[PDB]
């Protein structure tokens, strides 16, 4: 037990490598080269602070975020919070589900429907682990993170990127209205609200404590786990950018956000082996982030309302929007706009209570978050909310 909270940290980090980030990072590389690497880095650092504040809420108060809302806020407001939190968990799981089904299509050739059934069944077995023991799930998610990191490591060696061109991409410079829009879309759609509630419960009561000094030691050993777990997610997101830029930018490639076109152009440029590592890495990202999304939903309802439904019933409900899109044949860009609108709704409603309760001695006791870290959480919050509000102005304006 050298790293006590490494499990919850790896569980929370997988939501920031979901297939939603694959489509964004690839599109940024082909259209603008490496010149967007600074945006990927900026979004990852902001996601480390928010996820660290959730884990501390559970360690200090001995209670998770949905529990404290039920206990302190009025019943009319609590019922609304449970409602919107379920809708966001279903919105973010849609992209994690469809991505896991697309990777199977690139590796085997199966249609999107049968790919979704394969991912639906394997996600059962992942949450089947955490039923009796929560540690087997922490080992499984960690194993999937090992494959995505190794797969994109070989793609960098094969792509042979110009280091001088990669370095110039970390300079915050943007040209043309297209590149600016794509950067705003990264920072606006990065933080995962469903994993904000979940991280608090995973660390809540993980180590029994009778004093306040042993809880404080748990906070220090937890931060290293979050930084290491969230840090690895950032380097992976930058690898997707570099490979797409080192191969597609100078060759005039259109429709880069679609993971199918990016998969086909890797063979004549890099080779057939470069395409396999891409799809294998996309598969481990999808089903891992989908199984975490279900465990978050169970915590949301159990804390907000006191009762809970079985896990198999929760997995069944969240799969419903996934199969509907497959049957209707919706545009991949159309589903990323509607799902992010709901994600743009859940972000403000999640960051506000997290920044309030982690700052109240009534909740945290002698482990209140430093006010210097509370203001920066609000500054990061206003930046994200404003960008989301702007993204809603064009998404709801047409
Ligand atoms: C590692 C896991 C399986 C081996 C990967 C090899 C099996 C699939 C690799 C070849 C591939 O991905 O292309 C298949 C084709 O595109 C279909 O339409
Ligand atoms: C990845 C989840 C499994 C952990 C590593 C596998 C080694 C077996 C572990 C415990 C013995 C229980 C054996 C039966 C396995 C039931 C839990 C799955
Ligand atoms: C290849 C298609 C599958 C998609 C996921 C890619 C690999 C994910 C990593 C480990 C999976 C299980 C290994 C568990 C760790 C070793 C246990 C013995
Ligand atoms: C900018 C508006 C957000 C300002 C925070 C509102 C607030 O209530 O501050 C939290 C404080 O810790 C307790 O009241
Ligand atoms: C000292 C930390 C205060 C941070 C300065 C910003 C506090 C403004 C604010 O709204 O906080 C309301 C609270 O009641 C009062 O700090
Ligand atoms: C960007 C500024 C983020 C840092 C803001 C530093 C000022 C924080 C503040 O106003 O109150 C903190 C208090 O003085 C001590 O914890
Ligand atoms: C753009 C910036 C918006 C204001 C962001 C900071 C406003 C909210 C921070 C004040 C706060 O709530 O933290 C201090 C707390 O009230 C006691 O220390
Ligand atoms: C009160 C609402 C805020 C006012 C507007 C928000 C600031 C600019 C945002 C979008 C403008 C179009 C994209 C930026 C182009 C500005 C230069 C032309
Ligand atoms: Mn994500
Ligand atoms: Mn160029």
Author numbering: 39 to 436
What wording appears in the published article?
Transporters of the Nramp (Natural resistance-associated macrophage protein) family import divalent transition metal ions into cells of most organisms.
We also determined high-resolution DraNramp structures in metal-free occluded (WT) and Mn2+-bound inward-open (M230A•Mn2+) states and re-refined a Mn2+-bound outward-open conformation (G223W•Mn2+). Re-refined G223W•Mn2+ has six Mn2+-coordinating ligands: D56, N59, M230, carbonyl of A53 and two waters; the overall geometry resembles a distorted octahedron as in the occluded structure. A227 replaces a water of the outward-open Mn2+-coordination sphere, thus retaining a six-coordination geometry in both conformations. In the outward-open state, R244 forms an ion pair with E176 and interacts with the TM1a backbone, as does D263, keeping TM1a and TM5 close and the inner gate closed. A metal ion is present at the external site in all inward-open and occluded metal-bound DraNramp structures, but not outward-open structures, as opening the outer vestibule separates D296 and D369 and disrupts the site. Mn2+ binds at the orthosteric site in G223W, but Cd2+ binding is impaired.
